[PDB]
Design an enzyme around this catalytic site. Structure first.
Site, PDB file in Angstrom:
ATOM      1  N   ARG A 141      -2.940   1.709  -2.994  1.00 33.50           N
ATOM      2  CA  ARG A 141      -3.008   0.929  -4.346  1.00 33.50           C
ATOM      3  C   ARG A 141      -3.774  -0.480  -3.144  1.00 33.50           C
ATOM      4  NH1 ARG A 141       1.594   0.613  -2.197  1.00 33.50           N
ATOM      5  NH2 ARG A 141       2.827   2.164  -2.972  1.00 33.50           N
TER       6      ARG A 141
ATOM      7  N   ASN B  56       3.119  -3.177  -3.053  1.00 34.21           N
ATOM      8  CA  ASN B  56       2.889  -4.533  -2.690  1.00 34.21           C
ATOM      9  C   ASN B  56       1.094  -3.581  -2.958  1.00 34.21           C
ATOM     10  OD1 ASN B  56       0.673  -4.633  -0.027  1.00 34.21           O
ATOM     11  ND2 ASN B  56       3.076  -3.542   0.767  1.00 34.21           N
TER      12      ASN B  56
ATOM     13  N   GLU C 233       9.192  -4.068   5.507  1.00 26.03           N
ATOM     14  CA  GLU C 233       8.912  -2.796   5.226  1.00 26.03           C
ATOM     15  C   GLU C 233       7.533  -2.621   3.928  1.00 26.03           C
ATOM     16  OE1 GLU C 233       7.976   0.259   3.744  1.00 26.03           O
ATOM     17  OE2 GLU C 233       6.468   0.793   5.220  1.00 26.03           O
ATOM     18  N   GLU C 234       8.657  -2.632   3.042  1.00 27.98           N
ATOM     19  CA  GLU C 234       7.884  -2.420   1.418  1.00 27.98           C
ATOM     20  C   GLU C 234       6.594  -4.002   1.225  1.00 27.98           C
ATOM     21  OE1 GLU C 234       7.792   0.113   0.591  1.00 27.98           O
ATOM     22  OE2 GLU C 234       9.369   1.535   1.368  1.00 27.98           O
TER      23      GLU C 234
ATOM     24  N   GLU D 114       5.260  -9.567  16.938  1.00 29.82           N
ATOM     25  CA  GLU D 114       3.950 -11.505  17.039  1.00 29.82           C
ATOM     26  C   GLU D 114       5.439 -12.043  18.368  1.00 29.82           C
ATOM     27  OE1 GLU D 114       1.440 -11.851  13.812  1.00 29.82           O
ATOM     28  OE2 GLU D 114       3.300 -12.853  13.456  1.00 29.82           O
TER      29      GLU D 114
ATOM     30  N   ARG E 123       7.657  14.158  10.603  1.00 34.49           N
ATOM     31  CA  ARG E 123       8.740  14.052   9.468  1.00 34.49           C
ATOM     32  C   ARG E 123       7.953  15.813   8.781  1.00 34.49           C
ATOM     33  NH1 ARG E 123       6.750  10.103   4.757  1.00 34.49           N
ATOM     34  NH2 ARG E 123       7.333   8.589   5.975  1.00 34.49           N
TER      35      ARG E 123
ATOM     36  N   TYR F 215       8.256   9.360  -5.606  1.00 35.09           N
ATOM     37  CA  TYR F 215       7.802   7.968  -4.871  1.00 35.09           C
ATOM     38  C   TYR F 215       7.644   6.569  -4.957  1.00 35.09           C
ATOM     39  CZ  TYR F 215       4.551   5.205  -0.848  1.00 35.09           C
ATOM     40  OH  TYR F 215       3.646   4.264  -0.889  1.00 35.09           O
ATOM     41  N   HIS F 216       8.490   5.645  -4.505  1.00 33.17           N
ATOM     42  CA  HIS F 216       8.930   4.222  -5.206  1.00 33.17           C
ATOM     43  C   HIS F 216       9.374   4.293  -6.454  1.00 33.17           C
ATOM     44  CE1 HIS F 216       6.002   2.059  -1.715  1.00 33.17           C
ATOM     45  NE2 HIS F 216       7.305   2.529  -1.249  1.00 33.17           N
TER      46      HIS F 216
ATOM     47  N   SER G 251     -29.251   5.009  20.485  1.00 36.87           N
ATOM     48  CA  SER G 251     -28.856   5.940  21.146  1.00 36.87           C
ATOM     49  C   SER G 251     -27.921   5.958  21.327  1.00 36.87           C
ATOM     50  CB  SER G 251     -29.580   5.542  22.498  1.00 36.87           C
ATOM     51  OG  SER G 251     -29.448   6.713  23.156  1.00 36.87           O
TER      52      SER G 251
ATOM     53  N   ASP H 246       2.524   2.840  35.604  1.00 33.85           N
ATOM     54  CA  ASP H 246       2.008   2.275  34.535  1.00 33.85           C
ATOM     55  C   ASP H 246       0.842   1.628  34.572  1.00 33.85           C
ATOM     56  OD1 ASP H 246       3.948   0.486  35.408  1.00 33.85           O
ATOM     57  OD2 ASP H 246       3.182  -0.913  36.557  1.00 33.85           O
TER      58      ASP H 246
ATOM     59  N   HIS I  26      -7.500  -2.027  17.805  1.00 34.11           N
ATOM     60  CA  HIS I  26      -7.658  -0.942  18.914  1.00 34.11           C
ATOM     61  C   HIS I  26      -9.024  -0.157  18.729  1.00 34.11           C
ATOM     62  CE1 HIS I  26      -7.129   3.442  20.712  1.00 34.11           C
ATOM     63  NE2 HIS I  26      -5.734   3.400  21.040  1.00 34.11           N
TER      64      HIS I  26
ATOM     65  N   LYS J 102      -6.138   2.196   3.796  1.00 35.09           N
ATOM     66  CA  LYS J 102      -4.687   2.188   4.575  1.00 35.09           C
ATOM     67  C   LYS J 102      -4.541   3.316   5.250  1.00 35.09           C
ATOM     68  CE  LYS J 102      -2.332  -1.377   5.694  1.00 35.09           C
ATOM     69  NZ  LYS J 102      -1.339  -2.591   5.129  1.00 35.09           N
TER      70      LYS J 102
HETATM   71  O1  LIG Z   1       5.440   3.299   1.158  1.00 35.84           O
HETATM   72  C1  LIG Z   1       4.244   3.046   2.073  1.00 35.84           C
HETATM   73  N1  LIG Z   1       4.591   4.031   3.084  1.00 35.84           N
HETATM   74  C2  LIG Z   1       4.660   5.659   3.152  1.00 35.84           C
HETATM   75  C3  LIG Z   1       3.789   6.135   2.414  1.00 35.84           C
HETATM   76  C4  LIG Z   1       3.758   7.269   2.009  1.00 35.84           C
HETATM   77  C5  LIG Z   1       2.435   8.038   1.090  1.00 35.84           C
HETATM   78  C6  LIG Z   1       1.267   8.443   1.786  1.00 35.84           C
HETATM   79  N2  LIG Z   1       1.614   9.168   3.392  1.00 35.84           N
HETATM   80  C7  LIG Z   1       0.815   8.747   4.617  1.00 35.84           C
HETATM   81  O2  LIG Z   1       0.301   8.126   4.868  1.00 35.84           O
HETATM   82  C8  LIG Z   1       2.308   9.806   5.979  1.00 35.84           C
HETATM   83  C9  LIG Z   1       1.743  10.048   6.486  1.00 35.84           C
HETATM   84  C10 LIG Z   1       1.929  11.361   7.867  1.00 35.84           C
HETATM   85  C11 LIG Z   1       2.847  11.171   8.406  1.00 35.84           C
HETATM   86  I1  LIG Z   1       3.887  12.390   9.918  1.00 35.84           I
HETATM   87  C12 LIG Z   1       4.194  10.950   7.066  1.00 35.84           C
HETATM   88  C13 LIG Z   1       3.203  10.552   5.565  1.00 35.84           C
HETATM   89  C14 LIG Z   1       5.591   6.383   4.342  1.00 35.84           C
HETATM   90  O3  LIG Z   1       4.246   6.272   5.616  1.00 35.84           O
HETATM   91  O4  LIG Z   1       6.083   6.940   4.395  1.00 35.84           O
HETATM   92  N3  LIG Z   1       4.478   1.975   2.865  1.00 35.84           N
HETATM   93  C15 LIG Z   1       3.832   0.975   2.443  1.00 35.84           C
HETATM   94  C16 LIG Z   1       3.498   1.096   1.285  1.00 35.84           C
HETATM   95  O5  LIG Z   1       3.279   0.643   0.121  1.00 35.84           O
HETATM   96  O6  LIG Z   1       2.206   1.789   1.367  1.00 35.84           O
HETATM   97  C17 LIG Z   1       5.210   0.079   1.623  1.00 35.84           C
HETATM   98  C18 LIG Z   1       4.266  -0.400   3.055  1.00 35.84           C
HETATM   99 CA   LIG Z   2       3.203 -14.300  11.400  1.00 37.25          CA
HETATM  100 CL   LIG Z   3       7.612   8.000   9.602  1.00 36.44          CL
HETATM  101 ZN   LIG Z   4       8.996   3.356   3.517  1.00 37.28          ZN
HETATM  102 ZN   LIG Z   5       8.129   2.452   0.857  1.00 36.76          ZN
END
Ligand SMILES: O=C(N[C@@H](CCCCNC(=O)c1ccc(I)cc1)C(=O)O)NC1(C(=O)O)CC1
Ligand SMILES: [Ca+2]
Ligand SMILES: [Cl-]
Ligand SMILES: [Zn+2]
Ligand SMILES: [Zn+2]
Ligand SMILES: *[C@@H]1O[C@H](CO)[C@@H](O[C@@H]2O[C@H](CO)[C@@H](O[C@@H]3O[C@H](CO)[C@@H](O)[C@H](O[C@H]4O[C@H](CO)[C@@H](O)[C@H](O)[C@@H]4O)[C@@H]3O)[C@H](O)[C@H]2NC(C)=O)[C@H](O)[C@H]1NC(C)=O
Ligand SMILES: *[C@@H]1O[C@H](CO)[C@@H](O[C@@H]2O[C@H](CO)[C@@H](O[C@@H]3O[C@H](CO)[C@@H](O)[C@H](O[C@H]4O[C@H](CO)[C@@H](O)[C@H](O)[C@@H]4O)[C@@H]3O)[C@H](O)[C@H]2NC(C)=O)[C@H](O)[C@H]1NC(C)=O
Ligand SMILES: *[C@@H]1O[C@H](CO)[C@@H](O[C@@H]2O[C@H](CO)[C@@H](O)[C@H](O)[C@H]2NC(C)=O)[C@H](O)[C@H]1NC(C)=O
Ligand SMILES: *[C@@H]1O[C@H](CO)[C@@H](O[C@@H]2O[C@H](CO)[C@@H](O)[C@H](O)[C@H]2NC(C)=O)[C@H](O)[C@H]1NC(C)=O
Ligand SMILES: *[C@@H]1O[C@H](CO)[C@@H](O[C@@H]2O[C@H](CO)[C@@H](O)[C@H](O)[C@H]2NC(C)=O)[C@H](O)[C@H]1NC(C)=O
Ligand SMILES: *[C@@H]1O[C@H](CO)[C@@H](O[C@@H]2O[C@H](CO)[C@@H](O)[C@H](O)[C@H]2NC(C)=O)[C@H](O)[C@H]1NC(C)=O
Ligand SMILES: *[C@@H]1O[C@H](CO)[C@@H](O[C@@H]2O[C@H](CO)[C@@H](O)[C@H](O)[C@H]2NC(C)=O)[C@H](O)[C@H]1NC(C)=O
Ligand SMILES: *[C@@H]1O[C@H](CO)[C@@H](O[C@@H]2O[C@H](CO)[C@@H](O)[C@H](O)[C@H]2NC(C)=O)[C@H](O)[C@H]1NC(C)=O
Ligand SMILES: O=C(N[C@@H](CCCCNC(=O)c1ccc(I)cc1)C(=O)O)NC1(C(=O)O)CC1
Ligand SMILES: *[C@@H]1O[C@H](CO)[C@@H](O)[C@H](O)[C@H]1NC(C)=O
Ligand SMILES: *[C@@H]1O[C@H](CO)[C@@H](O)[C@H](O)[C@H]1NC(C)=O
Ligand SMILES: *[C@@H]1O[C@H](CO)[C@@H](O)[C@H](O)[C@H]1NC(C)=O
Ligand SMILES: *[C@@H]1O[C@H](CO)[C@@H](O)[C@H](O)[C@H]1NC(C)=O
Ligand SMILES: *[C@@H]1O[C@H](CO)[C@@H](O)[C@H](O)[C@H]1NC(C)=O
Ligand SMILES: *[C@@H]1O[C@H](CO)[C@@H](O)[C@H](O)[C@H]1NC(C)=O
Ligand SMILES: [Ca+2]
Ligand SMILES: [Cl-]
Ligand SMILES: [Zn+2]
Ligand SMILES: [Zn+2]
EC number: 3.4.17.21
Lengths: 694, 694
Positions: free
Chosen positions: B156, B203, B370-371, B382, B482, B498-499, B574, B610, B633, B643
């Site tokens: 988002r 967020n 994290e959220e 860091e 997962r 979700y959320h 190239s 290593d 990276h 993202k």
């Molecule tokens: O909510 C988040 N993450 C959830 C988002 C789920 C929605 C999109 N899913 C993926 O990108 C995904 C990719 C690989 C795997 I293995 C699992 C989920 C998560 O990573 O479980 N991260 C934030 C967000 O607002 O998006 C809170 C930072």
């Molecule tokens: Ca910082």
């Molecule tokens: Cl995960």
């Molecule tokens: Zn989460």
């Molecule tokens: Zn989340």
């Protein structure tokens, strides 16, 4: 037995003499065929000497050369436009070399082309404080003028940057006898002083650690994408040319306008040292005209990289490196260093042929294009940065072994202070009056530490030589050592014949070191350090020595800030975090040293050796210093006013510098506070690398 | 015996169920007292379970919360200024929790305050290509409009960045039943679908890896210098608010202007999905008005860090980490992951109490905030970056263990592909119809690799979770796994609840995983990976798998460029250097693998370990990607358009993106060539870390 004494005893003064003679008979200017042939010779010999592998690593970098058929010179020009006086087109060559060709005439490498014409202003050494004095106190405006400055005190690139920001349209650099003619000694060829026709060459870049101006961050290899010249790093925007004191006299003698502000502005010539602008009454219509036609061109350079593989830790690298390229013959700079490196390689190879190998890998390097901005060492380090980051134990530099014959001079990380003290106590002093005494004793007598009775002076590292990329960008523990003169006020000026055609084998053999005993002592110091770093079971670093200097540096930066107590109150500028971090570092270093003394277990050993090796690395901030991304070490950086000098806590120092002249004091003091946080955080982070790992 | 089977057999579905229930009875929003109490509980329990040390690491970071006495809402407003329709002030709470307080109402974290009023434009998913379609094809101008976009497809924050650059003065986000209501399943509490009153929190930052907006580069500790809000990283400049589909229907139903351009722009509501701008004829004088009063405030957060010290290499860290903070109850996100982590710690601790320790140190982390932009993991990394840089073997993430019940989903570095294949072949499939078959067999049947017959799909890592700092900034090998749904087009959209407030224990226990068998399988995969990484004598990484994918990625980026053959001819673009580097990497990796299979010597082992550990590190460019200094990276970065998605060779990809619209094609293609050089250099440099060390 194969121990350090065996290594050291194998070194011979006569071999160093043989090599110096061999390295100085013809010029070895970077990018030329002669210098490529010498690279090939050194590669062959290092193989013969017994190294496991010896390769050339080549790069295509921006270099600078005068135009052979359109010579650089400076004129005094009358109102008709007749050139009534011209500076010399070359230095009178030394006796017996008047038939060597390919002697590059004096020039300032990387000067742009131009023919600016104007009135002269004399700016003393062109230091930051000289420009403050001119502009703020004397109210002399340098805008649109040609500046004439004497060499000495600070790196010439900083002079040119200062002149440029003052609005000068050109810079003339000259060697004043005050700085380059020691009283009571004869000019070359009858002594070691600079003749009136001698001229100091040298680059005038402000790279700030970038290496090749066209490829910052990445090696200048065959497929490299290059910046256009307009986006190149560090090039000057105004023409620059160096001259000798016979020619300087002709330019200065007619100077009018203001008297010099005080005696520190007067050199030794028979002129008034008037600041200008312009000439006195009768000559006020004459001007000075520069004629600069040098060209920048991408040119191949070659480093020689020799490897002696470690028996037990072949993935840990101790590096001995120094450059091979010279302005002309390189009698002192760099061949007096390179001859020592060659004899060190020969000695290590002798032990290798008898079946010995060092514990860790030793890398030997003959760098190219050091004179054009540390290009060869920097490009190779950019290419190999991942290997160096993770495997580099230490870097020992080896440029000129002698710049005098009075005593030892050492600059190094505090991690090597104990190593240097211990080694010099086991070496014989070569000095007259100290026969049978240790080098530590003569050195400590002649160059006492300012803070500690019975210890010698060891200085900080800055830049101006090939250790810069290893220490300031990559955070590898680095050191250097050479024999030096007494002359304290001249410590950044160079010896009189520095970068002149007169730096020859005869200069060294007749006037500096006829028995090659100072060369041998320096080979023992550099070679001894490399031997201990490569062979000691526990790395020979003492973290407690860093804790000591960090407190000194914190007290020092605090004292600078405390020149502004009202602002510190107003903006709540506290150094408490930084002192807390230093206190913590002291405590943790003390506990680490106890564990290091108190642990048969090679995992704990190597875990502990890794903590020692990565301790210098911990001072690197991956975000770099403000507008200087390639200077990343938070404790040390080359001074923003003098690249040769090390500055401590440089981020905070630069934030405080001239702060009372900043127009938005809230913003300026905010930035001081930011740098205090960065420094306190980094000191604590470094300390935490010495804590128990889990 | 103490081996992986002992570890795995100790894991119990019923314990994971107990823990999930315990973690989801009250909200655990970042920065709140409830979440601090849970941190303290977890610290106590991890000590009880047998970890050597368990500490809270706290930071003071920018968070965002609605104003409790001045609620956020959106209106349709008439020409008199009467608000004739208002969106909801809260989601109807689920059954039995209608008396929980401190349920944070739906909001977009970090939205600035404002009350903008304007005409609506519907922008589909607000993807880069949706804005191209609107602006370039339909010639609809978003400047000064309020944009309404449906959630799904991309992060988002990218939607809001896209709306902002289009000139929108506000963004309304909504969940369309097309994306969040699976046909044939009931809404919560009677099924797992999103009700019309449900709303997705989240967020809307664009941090690009920076962590806390006020302290990029440095931990937000007690003495941290903070940027002012005006210089903060990643904050949106226009107000944003999310709503459910009952409220969306009311806003969309009056939309006029152009028809949607095609069916991919139509969701499932009974509205025309007209793009606007503005409402149809009779309502053309009505406007939409947002009312956003959320505040950003610096707030303390707490990570729990548990250590299990390694028996043989305590200075090598395998990290299992996932977050603990939730929007409301966190029934799936994150407590389904955290409950699994808690049972993994319990199992490792049981073996520890019997006298076993892993070979390497295992670190366990319960991350906070994290959220609000991965703040807890990023600040801790860091703070600890020097330790992690030099000692970090691998990072295994552990957010939600389930987002469906169909099959396994894995994203990881190619270095772990062989490890994951081998482990899943030894695990039992929990799927109906595959009893007695391996997890590898069920997973490969249900999710076949696009390129290889008889292998499963494994995706790239991007961002959107706590592995980001470890992999994209620091270059530590990372992975995640997962259980997932079938729904391919929904893979970045999230599961329906979700959320939302409806993510509860009851959701999981009734509709996702009543026997906790999918949770247990995921605990076996994550726990098994951590066990092998921490205990295998040789690190379980296969460099040859990187060589395979690097060729695929090179072919892919070459193919994108070859959509512009005339420009490639004109500017001599190239890819030869990059293919050469990949070929070299393949050859050297093959030789390294032979040596790894063919060497009693712990120095050669650890030297080789290593080389394996630092191989991911070798892909880090210390200069970062263009304008994204914390994404370093060179092979992988989060997509600049989404993202959540990993992009390969992101520097070259972004240089080519939309290149035909650039006004100075010479400059644009120059930059493509620069990125090709950077990528070719880095691939070669990484390959060279696998060569013999000396
Ligand atoms: O909510 C988040 N993450 C959830 C988002 C789920 C929605 C999109 N899913 C993926 O990108 C995904 C990719 C690989 C795997 I293995 C699992 C989920 C998560 O990573 O479980 N991260 C934030 C967000 O607002 O998006 C809170 C930072
Ligand atoms: Ca910082
Ligand atoms: Cl995960
Ligand atoms: Zn989460
Ligand atoms: Zn989340
Ligand atoms: C040098 O090493 C010492 C460790 O020996 C280390 O001390 C640490 O200092 C920090 C910051 O000064 C301490 O932080 C405190 O932590 C407690 C919880 O443990 C908090 O409750 C405290 O916050 C309250 O008080 C603050 C200060 O007035 C308020 O700003 C805040 O709003 C809270 O009310 C506070 O964060 C930390 O506990 C110690 N750790 C110890 C003693 O083990 C010191 O930081 C190191 N120096 C540097 C430069 O790193
Ligand atoms: C993959 O690994 C291979 C090594 O197996 C590595 O090959 C190297 O390629 C470089 C550049 O292509 C070679 O560079 C040449 O080096 C010789 C001296 O050895 C020079 O004389 C060459 O320069 C001349 O020719 C150039 C090309 O036309 C001209 O531009 C130039 O002006 C000169 O006339 C040239 O620099 C290098 O020798 C090999 N090394 C080998 C074969 O061992 C390759 O570079 C690796 N790929 C990547 C992306 O790193
Ligand atoms: C410097 O020393 C080297 C090495 O002895 C000399 O180079 C050798 O020259 C001899 C005689 O011409 C040749 O047979 C060898 O092939 C050379 N060996 C090499 C290059 O490894 C060199 O001539 C000496 N240079 C000067 C100026 O005295
Ligand atoms: C300084 O050098 C310049 C350049 O060589 C001399 O001026 C030139 O003199 C020749 C011969 O008289 C003329 O043909 C050129 O046109 C002149 N060039 C310029 C640029 O003026 C000058 O004579 C020299 N001055 C002194 C004092 O030796
Ligand atoms: C320099 O020499 C001193 C004196 O020998 C060394 O310090 C001794 O080291 C041993 C071994 O750890 C200790 O048992 C002694 O107690 C130390 N003596 C002291 C501190 O006075 C010191 O280690 C050497 N420095 C090096 C090798 O870097
Ligand atoms: C979640 O489980 C924990 C651990 O059993 C419970 O916390 C304990 O509560 C008991 C009974 O009040 C206390 O005697 C202990 O001191 C607590 N132990 C801790 C915090 O380590 C907690 O109450 C449970 N929470 C819920 C919502 O069921
Ligand atoms: C939408 O909410 C607004 C704000 O609460 C309501 O408008 C307010 O109504 C009260 C009572 O009639 C007035 O005293 C306020 O002055 C109004 N505020 C504003 C900003 O207009 C409005 O009635 C609600 N609309 C609907 C359809 O329920
Ligand atoms: C995954 O399992 C395969 C098959 O067991 C492992 O590959 C074998 O590893 C051993 C030890 O080096 C070799 O002797 C065999 O030749 C390998 N078999 C092959 C390549 O087919 C592989 O190492 C495992 N991957 C891991 C542990 O990361
Ligand atoms: O010439 C250079 N270096 C000489 C410069 C000598 C003049 C100033 N001397 C020092 O800064 C110095 C400091 C510590 C030691 I031990 C020795 C010399 C050198 O480092 O030997 N570097 C460059 C330059 O033009 O200045 C060629 C880059
Ligand atoms: C050097 O000067 C000559 C003679 O005036 C000129 O022809 C040539 O272009 C110049 N060489 C360069 C710029 O490399
Ligand atoms: C110096 O001279 C130029 C005009 O020739 C002027 O623009 C500049 O501001 C002057 N600077 C000072 C400090 O007087
Ligand atoms: C070498 O030392 C002697 C003895 O003091 C001295 O006279 C001579 O000038 C020295 N040489 C140099 C270059 O300093
Ligand atoms: C929240 O809104 C109330 C009531 O209108 C106000 O008094 C207070 O300033 C606000 N709280 C904030 C901005 O934190
Ligand atoms: C959109 O509208 C504004 C004026 O309201 C204008 O400044 C802007 O240029 C317009 N953009 C386009 C692409 O038409
Ligand atoms: C769990 O799997 C069953 C069996 O296919 C299915 O009917 C149910 O919808 C699944 N639950 C979820 C949330 O996908
Ligand atoms: Ca470069
Ligand atoms: Cl040196
Ligand atoms: Zn030199
Ligand atoms: Zn020099």
């Amino acid at each position: 037995k194969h121990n350090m004494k065996a290594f050291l005893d194998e070194l011979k003064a006569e071999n160093i003499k043989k090599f110096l003679y061999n390295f100085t008979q013809i010029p070895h200017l970077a990018g030329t065929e002669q210098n490529f042939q010498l690279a090939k010779q050194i590669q062959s010999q290092w193989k013969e000497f017994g190294l496991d592998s010896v390769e050339l690593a080549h790069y295509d970098v921006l270099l600078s050369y005068p135009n052979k058929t359109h010579p650089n010179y400076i004129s005094i020009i009358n109102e008709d436009g007749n050139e009534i006086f011209n500076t010399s087109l070359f230095e009178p060559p030394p006796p017996g070399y008047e038939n060597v060709s390919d002697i590059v005439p004096p020039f300032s490498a990387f000067s742009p082309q131009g023919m600016p014409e104007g009135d002269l202003v004399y700016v003393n050494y062109a230091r930051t404080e000289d420009f403050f004095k001119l502009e703020r106190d004397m109210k002399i405006n340098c805008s649109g003028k040609i500046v004439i400055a004497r060499y000495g005190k600070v790196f010439r690139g900083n002079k040119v940057k200062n002149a440029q920001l003052a609005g000068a349209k050109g810079v003339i650099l000259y060697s004043d006898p005050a700085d380059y003619f020691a009283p009571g000694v004869k000019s070359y060829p009858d002594g070691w002083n600079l003749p009136g026709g001698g001229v100091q060459r040298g680059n005038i870049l402000n790279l700030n650690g970038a290496g090749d101006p066209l490829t910052p961050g990445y090696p200048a290899n065959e497929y490299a994408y290059r910046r256009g010249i307009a986006e190149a790093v560090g090039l000057p925007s105004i023409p620059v040319h160096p001259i000798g004191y016979y020619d300087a006299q002709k330019l200065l003698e007619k100077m009018g306008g203001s008297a010099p502000p005080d005696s520190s502005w007067r050199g030794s010539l028979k002129v008034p040292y008037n600041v200008g602008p312009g000439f006195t009454g009768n000559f006020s219509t004459q001007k000075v005209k520069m004629h600069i036609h040098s060209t920048n061109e991408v040119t191949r350079i070659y480093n020689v990289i020799g490897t002696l593989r470690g028996a037990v830790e072949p993935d840990r690298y101790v590096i001995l490196g120094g450059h091979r390229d010279s302005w002309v013959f390189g009698g002192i700079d760099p061949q007096s260093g390179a001859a020592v490196v060659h004899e060190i390689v020969r000695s290590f190879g002798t032990l290798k042929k008898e079946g010995w190998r060092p514990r860790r890998t030793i890398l030997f390097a003959s760098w190219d294009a050091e004179e054009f901005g540390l290009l060869g060492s920097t490009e190779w380090a950019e290419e190999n940065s991942r290997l160096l980051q993770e495997r580099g134990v230490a870097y020992i530099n080896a440029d000129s072994s002698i710049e005098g014959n009075y005593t030892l001079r050492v600059d190094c990380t505090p991690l090597m202070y104990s190593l240097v003290h211990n080694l010099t106590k086991e070496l014989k002093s070569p000095d007259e009056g100290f026969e049978g005494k240790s080098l530590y004793e003569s050195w400590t007598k002649k160059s006492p530490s300012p803070e500690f009775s019975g210890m010698p002076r060891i200085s900080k590292l800055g830049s101006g030589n090939d250790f810069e990329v290893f220490f300031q960008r990559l955070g590898i523990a680095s050191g250097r050592a050479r024999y030096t003169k007494n002359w304290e006020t001249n410590k950044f000026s160079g010896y009189p014949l520095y970068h002149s055609v007169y730096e020859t084998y005869e200069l060294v053999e007749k006037f500096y070191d006829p028995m090659f005993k100072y060369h041998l002592t320096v080979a023992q110091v550099r070679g001894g350090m490399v031997f201990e770093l490569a062979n000691s079971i526990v790395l020979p670093f003492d973290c407690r020595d860093y804790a000591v200097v960090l407190r000194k540096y914190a007290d020092k930066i605090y004292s600078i800030s405390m020149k502004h107590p009202q602002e510190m109150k107003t903006y709540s500028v506290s150094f408490d975090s930084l002192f807390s971090a230093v206190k913590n570092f002291t405590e943790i270093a003390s506990k680490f040293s106890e564990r290091l003394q108190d642990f048969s277990n090679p995992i704990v050993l190597r875990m502990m050796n890794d903590q020692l090796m990565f301790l210098e690395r911990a001072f690197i901030d991956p975000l770099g210093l403000p507008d200087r991304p390639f200077y990343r070490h938070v404790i040390y950086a080359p001074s923003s006013h003098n690249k040769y000098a090390g500055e401590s806590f440089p981020g905070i120092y630069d934030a405080l510098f001239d702060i009372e002249s900043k127009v938005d004091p809230s913003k300026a003091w905010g930035e001081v506070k930011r740098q205090i946080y960065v420094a306190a955080f980094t000191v604590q982070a470094a300390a935490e690398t010495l804590s128990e790992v889990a």
